[PDB]
Symmetry: C2
Subunit: 102 residues, 2 copies
């Protein structure tokens, strides 16, 4: 239950409307909202999985691949705090090999 010992804490702390990187930069605000994080709402509400009580394992690997793909590998917008990667010319992991190969 410890807020600091929660895996969303650094993302929810970054994705805050009180952080100058979100309040001044719309691009970063939209990046947070795509990952369901609302920067306007409080920290507790940001890390909270709305209308969810229990996580049940289905064990479907093909479905697990397609999700990691759409969420982490090839998302709509780049994952938050990735300006360093975007500056080099890569928004996501899929873009790396589509632009540069060896």
């Amino acid at each position: 239950e410890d807020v600091r010992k929660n895996r969303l804490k650094p993302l929810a702390t970054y994705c805050s409307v009180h952080n100058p990187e979100i309040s001044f930069k719309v691009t970063n605000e939209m990046q947070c909202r795509e990952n369901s994080i609302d920067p306007t709402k409080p920290l507790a509400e940001r890390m909270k999985i709305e209308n969810c009580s229990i996580i049940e394992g289905t064990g479907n690997f093909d479905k697990c691949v397609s999700q990691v793909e759409s969420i982490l590998v090839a998302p709509k917008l780049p994952l938050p705090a990735n300006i360093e990667a975007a500056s080099s010319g890569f928004e996501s992991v899929d873009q790396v090999f589509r632009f540069a190969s060896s």
Copy 2:
């Protein structure tokens, strides 16, 4: 649009340059170099760094 007519209103000219070129909603195209250093627009320059 067919013809551009000049109205000569300076105060309206400032507020437009402000919203379009100086402080827009999103950064102006091909400005990843500026965004990487931490500045999306002209207004952000002095709000984050002053001398």
